[PDB]
Amino acid sequence: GQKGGQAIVVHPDYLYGAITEDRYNEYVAKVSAREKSAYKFFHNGMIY
Amino acid sequence: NGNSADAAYAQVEIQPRANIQLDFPELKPYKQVKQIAPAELEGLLDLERVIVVTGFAEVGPWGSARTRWEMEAFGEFSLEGCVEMAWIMGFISYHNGNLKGRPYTGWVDSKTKEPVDDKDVKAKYETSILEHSGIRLIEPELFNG
Amino acid sequence: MGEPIHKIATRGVMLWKEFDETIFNLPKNKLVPTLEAKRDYIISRLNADFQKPWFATVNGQARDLATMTYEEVAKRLVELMFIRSTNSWFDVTWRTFTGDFLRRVEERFTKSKTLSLIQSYSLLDKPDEAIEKVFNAYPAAREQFLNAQDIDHFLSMCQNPMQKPVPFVPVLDRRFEIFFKKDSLWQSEHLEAVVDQDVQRTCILHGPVAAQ
Ligand SMILES: NC(=O)c1ccc[n+]([C@@H]2O[C@H](COP(=O)([O-])OP(=O)(O)OC[C@H]3O[C@@H](n4cnc5c(N)ncnc54)[C@H](OP(=O)(O)O)[C@@H]3O)[C@@H](O)[C@H]2O)c1
């Protein structure tokens, strides 16, 4: 039905050049903590 | 020389357990990440108008995004991929408690309830996983006969 | 078993008394809900006042096993079970607990069949060096929380009957009374193996009339 589409995805590291070092480092710490909590959640969920 | 001569000579082997990872993107130190984009980019973008993907998943013929990627990129499963597929397909189930007297924490065969070591998942299930995944003859039991 | 005991009224024993009145007397259906509700209070009292502290406490911060790294678990085991003053493991079965944990770490973090970096638990008689050696081989284990499977294994190891009862409370669940009360009498003779060598955490049996 003539449904054409295109999406372009750009490497996420190009986002980080848009922000300051402090913003980036705050984000890195938050994501690191979230990732650890996600692994916790994931393995609990998988086995139960 | 008896058993004491060879007991201290003999040595303990570590068998790997599947440690499935979420594969969050790797974050570089700021200095490295600063070199990829142009210097002018800092403060130039309205970040409310930059759209990012923060998460993704799938359910498909090769399981989840993690297992489908292993099969797509590498053509075979790691230990993590095999255990994930065996769990997805109901081959293995987790067990924490008494199992035939002795206390057991780990995978068992879903049918028999026999303990399964992670290192044995491949030999025990991989052939079944590969036969009952991906593009294959239509299985009537999956489509109401 | 519900039997009266005459103990010196230390902080430890006064905590025991409070929990007898407010937790251990509750029926089974209301126990786990009460533990969940009073969780932070119970943890703070264990850590302040009792001879079995809350295991999952890292630099004075209450955690859970689920929110500790493998390295934090290994180091907490050494902090509670290895006596610096005598440079030894208080009980060999506690050394075996810790060695069995370090092998689990290697198993979880190794990509292939390899040799254990702890061939004999005798290597744990220098526990910091053994920990450093395992976590240098598997540095991902410094950053990752326990796999949920390794939490269950750790708690299964805490209930090993052929072992001196662990000197901590590792979980708040239906077995809390057993974790709290079991093997409560040796600490008054071995204050070197109690958190702050603090007598006030311990159970000393003594009679009120004889005490004169
Ligand atoms: N009449 C009195 O006034 C009086 C006063 C003090 C004590 N007692 C009695 O003395 C007995 C022990 O007292 P308790 O308060 O210590 O009772 P408890 O807390 O139940 O006993 C300690 C238990 O820990 C285990 N244990 C300790 N060290 C161990 C090791 N190295 N290896 C393996 N297991 C170990 C044993 O249990 P498992 O065998 O189950 O592993 C032992 O039964 C009790 O029967 C108690 O009633 C009586």
Curated annotation (Swiss-Prot), chain A:
4'-phosphopantetheine is transferred from CoA to a specific serine of the Acyl carrier domain by the C-terminal PPT domain. This modification is essential for activity because fatty acids are bound in thioester linkage to the sulfhydryl of the prosthetic group. Fatty acid synthetase catalyzes the formation of long-chain fatty acids from acetyl-CoA, malonyl-CoA and NADPH. The alpha subunit contains domains for: acyl carrier protein, 3-oxoacyl-[acyl-carrier-protein] reductase, and 3-oxoacyl-[acyl-carrier-protein] synthase. This subunit coordinates the binding of the six beta subunits to the enzyme complex. Belongs to the thiolase-like superfamily. Fungal fatty acid synthetase subunit alpha family. [Alpha(6)beta(6)] hexamers of two multifunctional subunits (alpha and beta). Present with 17000 molecules/cell in log phase SD medium. This is Fatty acid synthase subunit alpha. It comes from Saccharomyces cerevisiae (strain ATCC 204508 / S288c) (Baker's yeast).
From Swiss-Prot, chain C:
Coiled coil: none annotated. [Alpha(6)beta(6)] hexamers of two multifunctional subunits (alpha and beta). Fatty acid synthetase catalyzes the formation of long-chain fatty acids from acetyl-CoA, malonyl-CoA and NADPH. The beta subunit contains domains for: [acyl-carrier-protein] acetyltransferase and malonyltransferase, S-acyl fatty acid synthase thioesterase, enoyl-[acyl-carrier-protein] reductase, and 3-hydroxypalmitoyl-[acyl-carrier-protein] dehydratase. Present with 91800 molecules/cell in log phase SD medium. Belongs to the fungal fatty acid synthetase subunit beta family. This is Fatty acid synthase subunit beta. It comes from Saccharomyces cerevisiae (strain ATCC 204508 / S288c). The gene is FAS1. The chain holds residues 850 to 1061 of 2051 of the full protein.
